[PDB]
Structure 1
Amino acid sequence: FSMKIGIIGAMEEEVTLLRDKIENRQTISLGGCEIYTGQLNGTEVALLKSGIGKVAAALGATLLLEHCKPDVIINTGSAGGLAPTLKVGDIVVSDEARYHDADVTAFGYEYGQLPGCPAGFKADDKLIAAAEACIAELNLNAVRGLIVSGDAFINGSVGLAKIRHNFPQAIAVEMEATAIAHVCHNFNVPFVVVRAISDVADQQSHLSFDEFLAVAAKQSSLMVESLVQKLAHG
């Protein structure tokens, strides 16, 4: 009864379902971002609409942390599925997050690692465990593992081949998760990424995205709602 859960989403479509469920909602406009405060079935939350990309996600995560001091962070939204058993609508939960477009290897850093940061950012065990409890309880098809972020919308070709080569075990790719993990790391705040598949990052990922962003938003939102409740009570 004294916990505040932070939730971050990039697009309007990705946060609108959660925003509409907030009781006593109030809006905070700042730094070009929007923060919606209130409760989700009695649980205090702070929902940030960040905008697309690493910097927008970083700027917004920083404002959310400074301004609302949430206890944990949940990143929601869509994603391009990379694991083989994933289908549109399926859930992906992060074990860890890495930049697939960072390269300071000329200096001896691991591919994807930036100087002064760990090669990858690890998601919180408890948060990950609660997300799986919800996946079991809702009987959804989900996959857990490494999620990679970059500032490009992956649409087949070499973009996708480069990723599969450098991160063979990556299960999904998107554009804000790792930026958020990075900010949470520097502020020492627990985070987890729980997104849903809207495409498979191949040559038609853009068309698939147009057709299924809605189901990914809906499925991701349902998961966030369940996770907020499980973290609040049990």
Structure 2
Amino acid sequence: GQKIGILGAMREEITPILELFGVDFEEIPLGGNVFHKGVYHNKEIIVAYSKIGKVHSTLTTTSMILAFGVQKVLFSGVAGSLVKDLKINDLLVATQLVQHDVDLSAFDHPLGFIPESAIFIETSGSLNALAKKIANEQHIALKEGVIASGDQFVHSKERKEFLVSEFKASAVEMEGASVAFVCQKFGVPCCVLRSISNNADEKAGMSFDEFLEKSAHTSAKFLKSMVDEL
């Protein structure tokens, strides 16, 4: 079958992935990352955590595509909620992503926009539709919405209000847009899956720590259930 890249940002997001697949993994170092290469149900799977933020995740995604030849990329990890209906532990897939910290307003560009690019980055409608069917069959909620990504941990009402007002974002994190961007440039299907671990408000640091393990597992379990249908 088609070779699948599986990414998280932090080690804690991929430890449950490696465990859930349960196969032998070969560890391959490249570019400051460790890639775990295995075979699962007649598919080659390549798993890594990128390290946090846009530069790290851009690098790792580019390596997955150029050095390992992955044919699709699935991202799993944790995020901050920007909307009341996304509770702690809830899942969402990103229909579109934006780099919320991009600002070329000095030249009258819309926030998020860079010349020769676009504000919103698209993901795979097929993979998102698959996620929604699996969630419906598992009888669990799954939101489909905009994820905002930037190189700051968001933990204030004011920044939340900006993200909602400017981009109508549903969640915030630090890698999705860059992963999805790289995949679009190389024509590789991508799905960005997140489980909420905090509300991106003044208490978000403490919530992040409280729920990292559970929310990371929630996302990882759901990602595995997608791979089982691929």
Category of TM-score, reference length = shorter chain: over 0.9
Question: What is the CA distance between 1:107 and its match in structure 2?
Answer: 2.6
Residue 28 (1) aligns with residue 28 (2):
yes
Query: What residue in structure 2 maps to residue 19 of structure 1?
Result: 18
Matching residue's letter, 2:222: M
Query: What residue in structure 2 maps to residue 188 of structure 1?
Result: 187
Residues 98 and 177 in structure 2, CA contact (< 8 A), matched pair in contact too? yes
Q: Which of structure 1's runs of 4+ aligned residues deviate more than 4 A?
A: none
Residue 212 (1) aligns with residue 207 (2):
no
Q: How does 1:191-202 map to 2 (within 5 A)?
A: 191-202=190-201
Separation in 1, partners of 2:138, 2:183:
28
Query: What residue in structure 2 maps to residue 37 of structure 1?
Result: 37
Residues 5 and 73 in structure 2, CA contact (< 8 A), matched pair in contact too? yes
Question: What is the CA distance between 1:42 and its match in structure 2?
Answer: 4.3
Unmatched runs of 5 consecutive residues or more in structure 2: none
Matching residue's letter, 2:191: V
TM-score under structure 1 length normalisation: 0.93
Residues 76 and 193 in structure 2, CA contact (< 8 A), matched pair in contact too? yes
Separation in 1, partners of 2:158, 2:84:
18
Q: How does 1:97-176 map to 2 (within 5 A)?
A: 97-167=97-167, 169-176=168-175
Separation in 1, partners of 2:117, 2:214:
34
Percent of aligned pairs with the same amino acid: 34
TM-score under structure 2 length normalisation: 0.95
Query: What residue in structure 2 maps to residue 229 of structure 1?
Result: 228
Question: What is the CA distance between 1:188 and its match in structure 2?
Answer: 1.4
Q: How does 1:1-20 map to 2 (within 5 A)?
A: 2-20=1-19
Residues 103 and 113 in structure 2, CA contact (< 8 A), matched pair in contact too? yes
Residues 78 and 198 in structure 1, CA contact (< 8 A), matched pair in contact too? yes
How far does the alpha carbon of each residue in 1:173-194 deviate from its partner, in whole angstroms, 9 at most, with x for none?
0000001111112111111111
Residues 82 and 160 in structure 2, CA contact (< 8 A), matched pair in contact too? no
How far does the alpha carbon of each residue in 1:186-233 deviate from its partner, in whole angstroms, 9 at most, with x for none?
1111111111000010111101111011111111011100001112xx
Query: What residue in structure 2 maps to residue 78 of structure 1?
Result: 78
Matching residue's letter, 2:193: V
Separation in 2, partners of 1:118, 1:206:
31
Q: Secondary structure at the match of 2:136?
A: helix
Unmatched runs of 5 consecutive residues or more in structure 1: none
Separation in 2, partners of 1:96, 1:81:
16
C-alpha RMSD over aligned residues: 1.3
Question: What is the CA distance between 1:22 and its match in structure 2?
Answer: 4.2
Query: What residue in structure 2 maps to residue 66 of structure 1?
Result: 66
Separation in 1, partners of 2:105, 2:22:
45
